Every structure is written in structure tokens, then in C-alpha cells.
Amino acid sequence: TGLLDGKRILVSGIITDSSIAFHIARVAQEQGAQLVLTGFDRLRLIQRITDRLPAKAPLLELDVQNEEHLASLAGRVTEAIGAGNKLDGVVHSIGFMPQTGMGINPFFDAPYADVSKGIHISAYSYASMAKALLPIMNPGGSIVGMDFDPSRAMPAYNWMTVAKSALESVNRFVAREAGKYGVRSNLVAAGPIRTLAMGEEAGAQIQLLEEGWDQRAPIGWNMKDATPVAKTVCALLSDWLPATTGDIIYADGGAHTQLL
Amino acid sequence: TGLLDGKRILVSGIITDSSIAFHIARVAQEQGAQLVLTGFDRLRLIQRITDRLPAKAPLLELDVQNEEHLASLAGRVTEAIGAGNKLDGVVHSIGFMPQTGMGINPFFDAPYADVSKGIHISAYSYASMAKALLPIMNPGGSIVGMDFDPSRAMPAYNWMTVAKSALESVNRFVAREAGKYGVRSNLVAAGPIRTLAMSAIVGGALGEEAGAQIQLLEEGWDQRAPIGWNMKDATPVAKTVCALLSDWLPATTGDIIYADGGAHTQLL
Amino acid sequence: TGLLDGKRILVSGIITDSSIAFHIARVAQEQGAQLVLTGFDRLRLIQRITDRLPAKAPLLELDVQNEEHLASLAGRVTEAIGAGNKLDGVVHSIGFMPQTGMGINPFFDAPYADVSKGIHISAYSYASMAKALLPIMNPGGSIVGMDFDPSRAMPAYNWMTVAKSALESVNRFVAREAGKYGVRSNLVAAGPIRTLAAQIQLLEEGWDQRAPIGWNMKDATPVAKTVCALLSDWLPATTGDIIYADGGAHTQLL
Amino acid sequence: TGLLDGKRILVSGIITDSSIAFHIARVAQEQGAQLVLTGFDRLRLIQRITDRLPAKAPLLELDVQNEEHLASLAGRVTEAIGAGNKLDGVVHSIGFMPQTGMGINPFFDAPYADVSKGIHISAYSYASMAKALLPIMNPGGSIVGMDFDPSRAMPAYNWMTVAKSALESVNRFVAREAGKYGVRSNLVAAGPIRTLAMSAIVGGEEAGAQIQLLEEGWDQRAPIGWNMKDATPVAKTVCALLSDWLPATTGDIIYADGGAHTQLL
Ligand SMILES: NC(=O)c1ccc[n+]([C@@H]2O[C@H](COP(=O)([O-])OP(=O)(O)OC[C@H]3O[C@@H](n4cnc5c(N)ncnc54)[C@H](O)[C@@H]3O)[C@@H](O)[C@H]2O)c1
Ligand SMILES: NC(=O)c1ccc[n+]([C@@H]2O[C@H](COP(=O)([O-])OP(=O)(O)OC[C@H]3O[C@@H](n4cnc5c(N)ncnc54)[C@H](O)[C@@H]3O)[C@@H](O)[C@H]2O)c1
Ligand SMILES: NC(=O)c1ccc[n+]([C@@H]2O[C@H](COP(=O)([O-])OP(=O)(O)OC[C@H]3O[C@@H](n4cnc5c(N)ncnc54)[C@H](O)[C@@H]3O)[C@@H](O)[C@H]2O)c1
Ligand SMILES: NC(=O)c1ccc[n+]([C@@H]2O[C@H](COP(=O)([O-])OP(=O)(O)OC[C@H]3O[C@@H](n4cnc5c(N)ncnc54)[C@H](O)[C@@H]3O)[C@@H](O)[C@H]2O)c1
Ligand SMILES: Oc1cc(Cc2ccccn2)ccc1Oc1ccc(Cl)cc1Cl
Ligand SMILES: Oc1cc(Cc2ccccn2)ccc1Oc1ccc(Cl)cc1Cl
Ligand SMILES: Oc1cc(Cc2ccccn2)ccc1Oc1ccc(Cl)cc1Cl
Ligand SMILES: Oc1cc(Cc2ccccn2)ccc1Oc1ccc(Cl)cc1Cl
């Protein structure tokens, strides 16, 4: 069997076992993929977390805001997979926005330094990861990022919505670069997933926002099940979406296709 | 293995071995799907074409404007697949517009009876086939139709564009109905593919503007496409369709997947 | 000044005095436009309604499904407005879908005869009116039709959503044709209005909530003014396009 | 007479008399508007330029990255228009992106410091101008920003394209804020106009020819055609958005591009 048999795939963004990346990595491993992982803050804790995947996988440090980490990344990855071997797949599952650009804090009170850091990590970094990894990627490869539909404004998401709008633009441009390698670049726009990234009058906004997805989705939406979005990322890492790039696949129960 | 191992799938739209439906069917079978084929007019001709598939598949007559072919369809399919078996997949790959609604004929000169026949067959029938077949589809199933991105106007495509716009809208409503059965409904928006569908339109536009316009439209696709586009190769779109028929896109419905080389994401 | 000072404008769609088209006509006359009106079936009743407009306006019969009505339309319009004069504007404010394609009736149970009539009246007719009228329009002119955002599916609206999706596509192509004459073609996607045309209430009440500046289903005049903005020379570079007069509801998730 | 009669409108982004903002300001004054103008850096020569406007208007220095230009903006506007008078209109016609993110420079070589500056000037500033001026705006007022359709990627526009995608997102959130004041917020997505900033994009030595093919392609795809030398159709569109005639549209985008974006070719 194995949708990803033989593929060498870099998966970023594991922080907890509820991380979307954790489930992406699990499903990928279940589908015969050979993985390499990157982690940001507390690598020791992440190692214990990543010890719970179905199989072993090298874990490397990557602070996406660090020039040196990015500069060194491709070399460190070739070490881990073996010289003369290249990546078939790259997963960007990283996002951040300071608290000030987030929930109840007034949209207008988020300082640019805070917004800029959010855009760096959640949007720009998608291009910088591509810059680093494209040199060590095989023809027919696949870059996949994580998106939340920013086409309309909403409560609480605030400046992360802007970052995702920026990220979507970046993706279309990465696709132009990636095509030179016969590599695709796409985003998976997920419904809300109960993650540790994801408070009274603001918690009221979040729940109504959440309850909306399952109501609008013709096939429903389960906030506590990360695996349909995991599967969707693997569909795109696979050879079965060979003619789609610079695009957005919506793994959201169909909520975005329905007004109510 | 087989992406579609054990799946029973209905595929409509085979007319030539260059039909998108032909290639969708070839890949499905290659991936272990058990198929039922529906064909429109010249069934003896379609049979010889479907004879070219790598595995047997019964062929059933379906004229999608014939309410009687639709009434009997679920019954005829169940006969073919076996009592107590249902479908997991359905492929709508049918389209038509009178000459009058396309190519060189002025947009304004298409009479409504023509436009309406094209809309019946190209857009409305997606709902028809879904109404007929949902009763005999399994939970986790999938309905897929073929789209050509009508979000902007363009030369020659004319009233087929208007029909695809209706198709897209119809798809969102079919998804609402299909959701009740645990079934998905989606469109694949294909880049241009060398099939025989455009033959008389392209042939009749030879010395004319819009013949040139159609050629320009086609040549610019591979230019726009960040990974390129090959009109002679229907297999990347046949795979995209198989992908939506598989269990690997389980959270997408009412939606459109673009199998066009990324062309629609690029201005130039 | 007068936003529509000296312009000759055709307005279809008036069947009652709460028709969006009645309000378009009223605001247009207040703005100095000289109108020609078209009516469908109850022409004697329609004249009674149109007498309540500020100024007079010739009323012409127009069944959009009638081939001869369409072929004579331009001649009948030019008779009305007088020799040497031409239209500067056309308002398409017509729509119909059999009950079978709407509301409570199952989406699958709408026969195609019903769907096809609805698309004939609601979408194709936008092309036929432009076909009829463009030969007697001035450059700089403007054709405007009425939309209701069909980009997402929704309860009740059903096959009329499909009709509007069709209409948006027809508009892009009408724009191609009208540009050959220096004329613009655009749609106004309006929020829901209390006009004569369970979930219906839930859906419509979402508008005011979603709209950053609110939405009043009982007030037609904001949308009428929008139509007039597009009939004017103040949007001279927009065609094949859609203007949203919905309080901004379509730009917000909740 | 006049679409904008008796309205007080701030117009930013005048650099030359070919600036889109110069034409918005000229059209607005011809329609009866009473203006306050802001200028970025060459203030002495911006004054000489704004002297070419049909009527005199106060000029205020505004650098959109400068915290105290923004903190003092409302006070300085209020002095200009006179106490107890508020604005009815605000026009954001500003944009910048460092050369690294801007043309034939490879997309991957623009440093994030360069990208962040462009996003700051071209996008965030729409929010900071709104934050500043909404407290001095009347109900029924209008904030307008300038856009170039970023829904598709393209040669040359590069990271400015990313900036515009963020700008469109920011506009939707500004509308929620503006809503509370009875004020609308919208963008005008303009077609290409021969402007000082356009010279920052094109060139490849190749600038004249790249501009020929731009004009030819745009005009061709636009059903009503397109003239890059004429900013007045886009100016009229901004004025239309500042008037009372689009009263039910916010968080939205009006395309003044000859209809090119509705057409594939
Ligand atoms: N959970 C959801 O509702 C949902 C829905 C749609 C999209 N997304 C997006 O999916 C992605 C994954 O988020 P999640 O929900 O799994 O949350 P998460 O907290 O599990 O993952 C976020 C990751 O970003 C990483 N990160 C932060 N700063 C970094 C930096 N400087 N360098 C490298 N990594 C850094 C964190 O270590 C963490 O692993 C994000 O891009 C998020 O915006 C999430
Ligand atoms: N070929 C392309 O470049 C292209 C691109 C995008 C989308 N599409 C779409 O793909 C689908 C298949 O097109 P194609 O290129 O394979 O052309 P095709 O001729 O191979 O397929 C069209 C099929 O529709 C069938 N059909 C017509 N009227 C029917 C009716 N009355 N009842 C039942 N069947 C009927 C025909 O018999 C034929 O089998 C169409 O929906 C088309 O619009 C094609
Ligand atoms: N009221 C709303 O909530 C709303 C919102 C968005 C869009 N619209 C659209 O605005 C337009 C105007 O409708 P309305 O809301 O004023 O309701 P309405 O009932 O007053 O208007 C419908 C008009 O269409 C005309 N018509 C029907 N068949 C015709 C034919 N055969 N030939 C000529 N005319 C025919 C009717 O006579 C009537 O005057 C419609 O297209 C509608 O879809 C309405
Ligand atoms: N020219 C076009 O083809 C075109 C098309 C669509 C949109 N636009 C947009 O319209 C707006 C105006 O550009 P233009 O084409 O008139 O060019 P322009 O060069 O005439 O004006 C751009 C303005 O941005 C200002 N600016 C730069 N940094 C600033 C800062 N830190 N603080 C305050 N102001 C600053 C400059 O002073 C200048 O006045 C821009 O937002 C641009 O993206 C232009
Ligand atoms: O990008 C994300 C989207 C959602 C969905 C959501 C959005 C808004 C309200 C409730 N849920 C949940 C988590 C997301 O990721 C993040 C959000 C904030 C931060 Cl700081 C970091 C991440 Cl990775
Ligand atoms: O829907 C179709 C789209 C394209 C791509 C295309 C569109 C426009 C110009 C050139 N190529 C090619 C064939 C298509 O299918 C048809 C076209 C006309 C007819 Cl009559 C029937 C079909 Cl099935
Ligand atoms: O096109 C229309 C949209 C709405 C608003 C609406 C739409 C969907 C659900 C609730 N309200 C109201 C009336 C509309 O017009 C019509 C609808 C049906 C018919 Cl038969 C005729 C018209 Cl003119
Ligand atoms: O935002 C702008 C869009 C266009 C249209 C365009 C875009 C791409 C190629 C040619 N023309 C032209 C100028 C624009 O503004 C700017 C461009 C670069 C800079 Cl550095 C600054 C501005 Cl304000």
C-alpha cells in the first residue's frame, strides 16, 4: 500500500501531540513516508513528544527567524537523510502572532513590531523555508503550508488573519520558484482544530465562530479530530494531486462553501 | 494497494479514447476500482472504446435529458453491481453546448433553446445524477464533476462559460444534499486537454479571430502554469479526480480542486 | 447639480411601489434622469404604480421571454425619447424562479422546465436586453443588473442562487459586447430587501449582524443610490463587475 | 453643484502631479471638497506641486512610520480645518517597497527587514491612519485606500503583491472599527498608471518596452480599454467612494481597471 512509500519528508511545527504537524507526521509515517522533523523552542520536550510517533525520525533545530538556522538547514537535512538523497516533501506548519494582535486586544492597539514578528513567522518564513529546501528537493516534490481562510474578517483572529492573507500571497510566489524544480507549493486551509495554539467576552466570540463550522459544513466538522486535515496534507504530498500549485485546498468540512 | 481498492464507481462521459472520462476510468481501474460505465448516444461505438480499458466494466445507456433513463438508473446500476452492493463514487464528465453558443457565433446570437439545452446537460444534470444515485451510495462516498474555470470571461467559450458558472453553483447545493448520506461532492477544474470536444468549434474558426484567440488561450496556459501544462496529457487530471474519489480528501465538499498546473493562480 | 442630469435611462422591474426598480426610478428622477420604463404583464396596474413617481415616463410592454417584444424594443424606445436621442442607461431589475426551485421545496425536486424558465428570465434576459439596447446607447453609457451574492450556497434561495451565478457569468460577457460601444456593464449585489418577491429570517437577520455599518431590510434607498452611482459618470472604469450594496456583510465571517 | 460639496477630506500620497493622489485631490476640489493634504519626505517641493491644485489647501507632514506624526495628526488636522469641524473623508494613497522585493531581484533574496518596511508603509499604515483619524471623523464618512489586485501572482510586483494582499485583509478589519463611527472603509483596485512609483517596478534598461507591453495588454483585456496616462477615471472612482452614493459598501474593493480583472484574455 502506502500513499507516501519511499518519500523523504520534512515536517515542521510539532510542539505538542495535539499539533496539526504531529498528526501530519503520524499519518505520513503510517503511509510509508520517511520523515525529518524540525522544532523551535524546547527541543528536549519535542523529542519526548516525537518519541510517540509510529517510527523514528531525526529532529533538527529550526528557529525560522534565525539566519544561521536557515543557512545551515539544507546541510543538516542531507546529513540526516544520507548524502545523494533529497527531500520529496516539505511541510510548513508554523504560526505565531503576539497576544496584542490576537483576541480581545483592540485591532488598532497592536504595534507594528508585534505585527511584523507575526508576519515574519507565519508568512515570510514560508518563502525562507522554500529558499533553503528547494535546492535539496526532487522533481515531483511538494511543499505544503497551513492556512486559515482569511478572505473575510472575523472576531479574535485579527492580525493573524492579515498574516494568513499575506501567507496566501507568498504561496503563489513560492510556486513560481518551486516550478523551476518540478516541485509544487500549496496551502491546506483547515477548519478550527483543538490545538494548544488556538477570556470571557472573547471566549464567547470563539465558541460562536467554532460552532459555525460544524453547522455550515455539509459533512460536519469535528474540532477534536486533526486527522482529516492530516490526510489532506498527505494527499498533497503525494503523486495524486500532480497538477495543482500556488493553490489552496480547503480541508474544512465544506464550511467555506456555505453561507449558513 | 490501489488508491481505489474495493471501490465501486460510476463513470459517465466516455465518447472517444481521448475523452477525459476514458482516462479517469483507466486510472481508477489501475487503482483497483470496480467500475460501471454510462454512455450517451452511439453505444456500440462507446463499447468498442470501453473495450480498450484494462478491465471489464458494464456499460449502461444514460441520456441525461431523458427522465426515463434517470428514473431507472439506480435500479440498472444495482443490477450491474449486485443487490446489496452500493457505489462509493460517481464521475460526471459530461458537457455540451450547441455551436450557436460557442466559438465564432456572436454571444448575442445564441437562441435560448440552445443555451438551455447546454445548461440542462452541462449543469442541471449534475444534480439529476446526484438525485438518482445518492440513494445507492455508501457513507464516505464521493461525487466529482468536471469544471472549466468560468470566474472570468474569455473568447469563444461563451455560453459554455455561463453553464460552468451554474455548475459550480449547483455543486454547492448537491454538497448540501450529499452531506446527509456521508457523501462528498466536488468539481475538478481542468486545464485545457486535447479531446474531441472542441473540434468543430476550432475547425470552424480557422481563418477567424477567436481561432487565434483560442490558440492564444491554450498556449498561455503552459506559460502561466508554474509547473507547466501539457494539453496532450489527460493523466494529471484523471489522477486529481481519483484523489477526490479516494479517502484522502475526506474534509472537502461543495468545492473546486484546480488541476491546471497552477495557471489560474498566476496573472502572467 | 443632479447626479444623472441630462441622461436618458431605461428601467425595467417595477411591479409594485416597493420594487427595488421603483426606488431606482424615483432616485434617478430626483437626480435629473429622464426615464423610460418597461413592464411585463399587468401594464395598467404598472402605470398606476409608476404615476406615483416624481415625473412622468413612457411605459413600454416587455416580456423578456417574448422574441417580438425584444426585436421591437429599440424602435419603441427611440419613438419614446425622440429623434436624435439615445439611451445613456439601462437597468435590468427582473427575476423569477418557480416556487419549485425555491424555499421549502427540495432542491432535487425542481424540474428542469421550471429551472430553465427561471434562468431565461433571471440570467439570459440580461444578454437579450443588452442585445436589443446597445445599438441605441451612447458611449459612456451604463447597463446595471441586480445580483444576490451566489458565491456560497444557502438555504431556501436554491435554484435562484444558481440563476444568479449564471447572471454573474452573463454580465462578464455582456461587458465584452458593451465595450465595443463604449458602454459599461455591471451588477449590484444587494443585501436582502422587504420586496414582494424559517431559515429565510435567520439568513436575512445575519446581514445586519455581519454588516460593519449595519443593514436595514426595510430600506431600499441605499441600493437604489448604488445603482445610480453606476449609471453616473463616477465609476467610468468599472465593467464586467459586481458592486456590493450589502452594508459590507459579504466581507465578514461573523 | 458638486459630488463632494461641503465635505472635509484628508488626501495623502501626493509626490508629483502625476500621483494618483494628485488627481483624487484635483477631482475632489472640482466637486466642491475642502481638503487637507499630507506629504511624506520632499515637503518643500510637495508644496510647490500642491500649488498646482485648483484651490489652496493646508499641507501637513505625515511619515507613516513615525509614531509622533501619527500621535499628533488629529490635532494638526483639527487646527487646519478649525476646532469643532471634523473630516468626512480620508484618502490613503501611499505605498513603498525596497528594490530587493520589487522587480527582477529574485523573490527569495528580499531580506525580511526590506519586506517588513514595505508591509509597514503599504499595509499596516492603512490601519494606523484609520486609528488616528476616526476620532475626528463624522458619521456617514469614508476612508479609501489604493489597491492593485493581488489575488494572482505576477512578474515584477513580487513582494509589493504580498503587501497588497495584507492591505486587503487590513481593510476588512478597518471596516469593523470604522463601522462604530458610521464610517465606511474600502479600497480602489486601480489599473496601471504612469506614476513615479511605477518607475520603481519596471526596468529589467527595458523600462519603455515593458511599459508598452503593459499598456497594450491591459487596454486589450479591459472591455472598455485602458489609458495608463490618464489617472482621472480612478480619481473619479475614489470620489464616488467618498460621496454619499455608495452608502452600503464597506470592507470592500471597487475595481477601476477598465474591467481587465473580469477577463482572462
Ligand atoms: N489549530 C487550528 O485551528 C488551525 C487551523 C487552521 C490553520 N492553522 C495553522 O496551522 C499551523 C499549525 O498550528 P497548530 O494549530 O498546530 O498550533 P501549534 O502551536 O501546535 O503549532 C504552531 C507551531 O509554530 C511553531 N513556531 C512558532 N514560532 C516559530 C519560529 N520562530 N520558528 C519555527 N517554529 C515556530 C511552534 O513551535 C509550533 O510548533 C499554523 O500555521 C496555524 O496558524 C491552525
Ligand atoms: N477537454 C478540456 O480541455 C476540458 C477542460 C475542462 C473541463 N472539461 C470538461 O470535462 C468534461 C468532459 O469533456 P471532454 O473534453 O472529455 O469532451 P468529451 O466529448 O470527451 O466528453 C463529453 C461527454 O459528454 C457526453 N454527453 C453529451 N450530451 C450528453 C447527454 N445528453 N447525456 C449523457 N451524456 C452526454 C458525451 O457523449 C461525451 O461522452 C466536460 O464537462 C467538459 O466541459 C474539459
Ligand atoms: N429584494 C431583495 O432582497 C433583492 C436582493 C438582491 C437582488 N434582488 C434582485 O433584484 C431584482 C428585482 O426584484 P425585486 O426584489 O424588486 O422584486 P420584484 O418582485 O418587485 O421584481 C421582479 C420583477 O421582475 C419582473 N419580471 C418577471 N418576469 C418577467 C418577464 N417575463 N419579463 C419582464 N419582466 C419580468 C416582474 O414583473 C417584477 O417587476 C431581481 O432580479 C432580484 O433577483 C432582490
Ligand atoms: N500607479 C499605479 O499603476 C497604481 C495602481 C494601483 C494602485 N496604486 C497604489 O496607489 C497608491 C499611490 O501610488 P502612485 O502610483 O500614485 O505613486 P506615487 O509615487 O505618485 O505616490 C506614492 C506615495 O507614497 C508615499 N509614501 C511612501 N512612503 C511613505 C511614508 N513612509 N509615509 C507617507 N507617505 C509615504 C510617497 O510620498 C508618494 O506620495 C499606492 O498605494 C499604490 O500602490 C498605484
Ligand atoms: O492560525 C490558527 C487558526 C485557528 C482557528 C481559529 C481562528 C480564530 C478563532 C478560533 N480558531 C487556531 C489556531 C491557529 O494557530 C495559531 C493562532 C495563534 C497563534 Cl499565536 C499561533 C498559532 Cl500557530
Ligand atoms: O468545457 C471544455 C473546456 C475546454 C477547454 C477550453 C476552453 C476554451 C477554449 C479552449 N479550451 C475544452 C473542452 C471542453 O468541453 C466541451 C466543450 C464544448 C462542448 Cl460542445 C462540449 C464539451 Cl464536453
Ligand atoms: O433575488 C432575490 C433575493 C432576495 C433575498 C433573499 C435571498 C435568499 C434568502 C432570503 N432572501 C429576495 C428576493 C429576490 O428576488 C426574487 C426571488 C424570487 C422570485 Cl420568484 C423573484 C424575485 Cl425578483
Ligand atoms: O502599487 C502599484 C501598482 C502599480 C501597477 C503595476 C504593477 C506591476 C507592474 C506594473 N504596474 C504601479 C505602481 C504601484 O505603486 C508602487 C509600486 C512600487 C513602489 Cl516602491 C511604490 C508604489 Cl506606491
Helix, strand or coil, per DSSP, at residue A258: strand
The DSSP code sequence of C36-90 is EEEE-S-HHHHHHHHTTSSS---EEE--TT-HHHHHHHHHHHHHHH-TT--EEEE
Domain that holds residue C1: 1-254
Asked if C225 lies within 8 A of D246 by C-beta distance, the reply is yes
Asked if C206 lies within 8 A of A153 by C-beta distance, the reply is no
C-alpha cell belonging to residue D53: 491644485
Nearest chain B Cα to A173, which residue?
Answer: B266
Asked if A162 lies within 8 A of D170 by C-beta distance, the reply is yes
> What DSSP character marks residue C153?
B
Q: Position A146: which residue type?
A: M
Q: What is the resolution of this structure in A?
A: 2.0
* DSSP β-ladder status, D87-92 and D137-147: parallel
* DSSP β-ladder status, C34-39 and C59-61: parallel
Kindly state if the Cβ of A236 falls inside 6 Å of ligand 1: no
User: Which residues touch C135 (CB under 8 Å, ≥6 apart)?
Assistant: C74, C181
CB neighbours of residue C54 within 10 Å? 11
C-alpha cell belonging to residue C223: 441600493
Q: Number of A to B CB contacts under 8 A, please give it.
A: 139
**Rounded Cα gap, residues C57 and D237, in angstroms:** 30
Contact D95, D117 (CB under 8 A): no
After which residues does chain B become discontinuous at a C–N distance over 2.5 Å?
none
**Rounded Cα gap, residues D28 and D24, in angstroms:** 6
* DSSP β-ladder status, B137-147 and B34-39: unpaired
- C221 at A interface, C-beta within 8 A: no
Residue C78 sits at the vertex; the CA angle it makes with C75 and C82, to the nearest 5 degrees, is 145
**Rounded Cα gap, residues B123 and B106, in angstroms:** 22
Distances (CA, A) of B254 to A216, B44, C251: 11, 35, 20
Nearest Cα of chain B lies from the Cα of C29 at a distance, in angstroms, of: 31
Nearest chain C Cα to B64, which residue?
Answer: C112
CATH of the domain at C36: 3.40.50.720
What is the number of structural domains in chain B?
Answer: 1
**Rounded Cα gap, residues B34 and B55, in angstroms:** 9
Distance from the alpha carbon of residue D234 to the mean position of ligand 8, in angstroms: 15
C-alpha cell belonging to residue A256: 467555506
Kindly state if the Cβ of A195 falls inside 6 Å of ligand 1: yes
Residue ranges around ligand 3 (CB below 6 Å): C 13-16, 19-21, 40, 62-65, 93-96, 121, 146, 148, 190, 192-193, 195-197
H or E stretch covering B82: none
Q: What are phi and psi of D84, to 5 degrees?
A: 75, -5
**Rounded Cα gap, residues C113 and C25, in angstroms:** 33
User: Which residues touch C209 (CB under 8 Å, ≥6 apart)?
Assistant: C254
Distance from the alpha carbon of residue A203 to the mean position of ligand 5, in angstroms: 13
- B216 at D interface, C-beta within 8 A: yes
Neighbours of chain B (3+ CB pairs under 8 A): A, C, D
**Rounded Cα gap, residues B55 and B50, in angstroms:** 9
> What DSSP character marks residue A108?
G
User: Which residues touch D247 (CB under 8 Å, ≥6 apart)?
Assistant: C222, C225, C226, D140, D184
**Rounded Cα gap, residues B186 and B144, in angstroms:** 5
Asked if C237 lies within 8 A of D234 by C-beta distance, the reply is yes
Nearest Cα of chain A lies from the Cα of B41 at a distance, in angstroms, of: 32
Distance from the alpha carbon of residue D179 to the mean position of ligand 8, in angstroms: 29
Q: How many Cα neighbours within 13 Å face the side chain of B52?
A: 13
Within chain B, residue ranges assigned H as helices are 20-30, 43-50, 67-81, 112-119, 125-133, 158-179, 199-203, 211-224, 235-245
**Rounded Cα gap, residues D55 and C124, in angstroms:** 49
Best residue in A152, A154, A216, A250 for a mutation probing chain C (most C CBs within 10 Å): A152
Q: What are phi and psi of C195, to 5 degrees?
A: -125, 170
Considering only the beta carbons, identify the residue of A208, A209, A260 that sits closest to C155. A260
Experimental method: X-ray
Which residue, by CA, sits nearest to atom 25 of ligand 4? Answer: D94
Distance from the alpha carbon of residue B92 to the mean position of ligand 8, in angstroms: 44
Contacts with D157 from chain A: Cβ below 8 Å: none
**Rounded Cα gap, residues D262 and D265, in angstroms:** 9
Helix, strand or coil, per DSSP, at residue B7: coil
Per-residue burial over B159-194, b = 16 or more CB atoms within 10 Å of its CB, e = otherwise: bbbbbbbbbbbbbbbbbbbbbebebbbbbbbbbbbe
User: What's the per-residue H, E or C state across B124-174?
Assistant: HHHHHHHHHHHHHEEEEEEEEEEECCCCCECCCCHHHHHHHHHHHHHHHHH
C-alpha cell belonging to residue D129: 491612519
Give me the residues of C, 145-164, that contact B with CB < 8 A.
Answer: 150, 152-153, 158, 161-162, 164
C-alpha cell belonging to residue A183: 516541485
**Rounded Cα gap, residues B134 and D238, in angstroms:** 51
Rg (CA), chain B: 18
CB neighbours of residue C172 within 10 Å? 27
Q: Position C244: which residue type?
A: Y
Distance from the alpha carbon of residue B159 to the mean position of ligand 3, in angstroms: 23
Asked if C234 lies within 8 A of D239 by C-beta distance, the reply is yes
Q: Could you identify the atom of ligand 5 that is nearest to the CA of residue A118? A: 20
D8: buried, middle or exposed (CB in 10 Å: 19+, 13-18, 0-12)?
buried
Considering only the beta carbons, identify the residue of A152, A154, A260 that sits closest to C206. A260
Q: Position D137: which residue type?
A: M
Contact D71, A111 (CB under 8 A): no
